[PDB]
Structure 1
């Protein structure tokens, strides 16, 4: 009768499989700058904003015209192998990417057709900027917990190639203003990649990492959003941490790894300092892969898994601040 924080946590949801795809092509910020240099000089800007300010040394792009659905499919095939299960077991496939093949059908339906899902497989896309993979995990978890399905795929493929192409053209225009030039620099922090996760009912996969679920707080009063954005983002993260304390029992010092969505080196620095987080517990791929949107979190988690340092029982915080503004925080126990 009496609510407790722990009551809303998932007790029977696990991560059966996890995979990521690294986009193959390294575009260094050094190479990008060589092309921007004339516009940098002309504008009188001495600042290597990419390398020294945003803190990105390289990002990965696709070599070919990869669609979001292609990248998500490739990650999903790899995640199924990691879980050692066939596609026929999948009862739900959710796509969470910002990148999108078409207006219709859903990117999820395209990935599902590529994989050969059965006619029982439910599919749809969830869109929520950089936080959507966590949303997708939670939506799948609720179906798993209820027993409506036994296995789910959550997938996310991102492609920035076209954004880079268009952006580099506008920024090297003879009539580009320093303002426009600045406003467009931010696209050059984006990167390509993909991730997929197979979630399952725990009884089917004893000893797999457990997904506990988590919390969300919002500040939709700031859906218009500068230094103001960082300030409001941090304030929202503060209230979300309170919610995490109340539901997950989180105390910063008791978490073993923080898998954090990253916007830039300085944004991450400010977040980490604000909450007293130990930098050594924050794996970052931003410097060499850039910001892969909602795929960033599961790609980092996947990279942590394959590095083999995680121990059974490790408490892993998944979190990010997304446009909205929204903030989500969730826990995996390895």
Structure 2
């Protein structure tokens, strides 16, 4: 019996920041409404592709773990916004990092993708011959947004988070997990016409709908994450009070609060950074984990509950038992190339096109 210890953690947030005030200059919205309803103050807009965000996050996690790129056997990138479909962006991260041989694939389960990835990498390592793995959640959601619709335009940001996993006999890392999907919620969070269903030669194919029914997402997410968390906790044999930290998906603060309240988990145990970055889909959990560790929220031997949901409607929860070390072995100098533009400047073309159309 082995386990997959989380030995490295890292993040990459692009520098360009879009404030609620910035959004109010081109949409009929306010910082007052957004902060009160969502809890989001700011979000980051990438000047580079998803794979570049993923690469920097991975470099930080590798340094943190002190592992050699020659030791990495498996690379999973969880994303719904890959640079390209052919080939996958896991292979681009592999190419960028100079990792020889590793299995490299992209996984799409929306914002639950990082937990899906962590479950998958963990079980691969437990049942087969993978010694070290790199699991990355990375998104450039700004690509997708309709800048005339305030409902969806204020919720999402770009970013990437990463972990490195190391095979061990110590009972650490992901213990039980339950992942799933409520396919009856499929049509309430969707971009139906980007992908091979779109008309390739229609000049207006860029003006797609972002389907979004917020109250239905709320209900299904709470139900989905809640029951998954219960299964995990029940299988662990832990009482609810033994959970030290909750690392949730960062989509909505009231969802996080409701999840904890219905579970009877203390509100102050949930790590929240949505105010800074908004919803970065698959990046939310690994960015949050990385920041929780940086800010001293996770102690050695802590019991963590991870929980997430996403378009699908995918859902999941996991129980992580932390090991001995909460400090990086090394630091990485890795950074994105310099950003010569403001967030409004980056979005200028897309805003003008959506408004004209």
Q: TM-score by structure 1 length? A: 0.82
Q: Which has a greater percent of helix?
A: 1
1:117 alignment partner in structure 2: 99
Are residues 1:304 and 2:292 paired? yes
Residue-by-residue CA offset, 1:176-215 (whole Å, 9 max, x unaligned): xxxxx3xx42232111111111111015xx79x5222411
8 A Cα contact 1:214 1:247, kept in partner: no
CA distance in 1, matches of 2:174, 2:227: 22
Residue-by-residue CA offset, 1:257-292 (whole Å, 9 max, x unaligned): 000002223333333332233221111111121011
Are residues 1:277 and 2:265 paired? yes
Choose from 202, 218, 222 the match for 2:181.
218
CA distance in 2, matches of 1:152, 1:245: 26
Gaps of 5+ in 2: 189-213, 323-357
CA distance in 1, matches of 2:181, 2:98: 37
Tell me the secondary structure at the aligned position of residue 283 of structure 1: coil
Mapping for residues 182-193 of structure 1, pairs under 5 Å: 184-193=150-159
8 A Cα contact 2:31 2:41, kept in partner: no
1:241 alignment partner in structure 2: 229
1:31 alignment partner in structure 2: 22
- Equivalent pairs, count: 297
The Cα shift of 1:29 comes to 0.5
2:61 alignment partner in structure 1: 79
Are residues 1:259 and 2:240 paired? no
CA distance in 2, matches of 1:33, 1:96: 31
Are residues 1:22 and 2:10 paired? no
CA distance in 2, matches of 1:85, 1:297: 22
Bigger shift: residues 82-91 or 184-193 = 184-193
Mapping for residues 86-105 of structure 1, pairs under 5 Å: 86-105=68-87
The Cα shift of 1:11 comes to 4.2
The Cα shift of 1:57 comes to 1.1
CA distance in 2, matches of 1:269, 1:309: 18
1:57 alignment partner in structure 2: 41
Choose from 301, 311, 316 the match for 1:328.
316
Gaps of 5+ in 1: 1-9, 41-45, 172-180
8 A Cα contact 1:319 1:330, kept in partner: yes
The Cα shift of 1:78 comes to 1.1
Are residues 1:201 and 2:167 paired? yes
8 A Cα contact 2:111 2:281, kept in partner: yes
CA distance in 2, matches of 1:99, 1:222: 21
CA RMSD across the alignment: 2.2
1:69 alignment partner in structure 2: 51
CA distance in 2, matches of 1:202, 1:304: 23
Q: TM-score by structure 2 length? A: 0.77
The Cα shift of 1:150 comes to 0.6
1:131 alignment partner in structure 2: 112
1:174 alignment partner in structure 2: none
Choose from 112, 118, 129 the match for 1:148.
129
8 A Cα contact 1:30 1:57, kept in partner: no
8 A Cα contact 2:232 2:319, kept in partner: no
CA distance in 2, matches of 1:280, 1:242: 19
8 A Cα contact 1:217 1:239, kept in partner: no
CA distance in 1, matches of 2:6, 2:261: 30
CA distance in 2, matches of 1:224, 1:32: 27
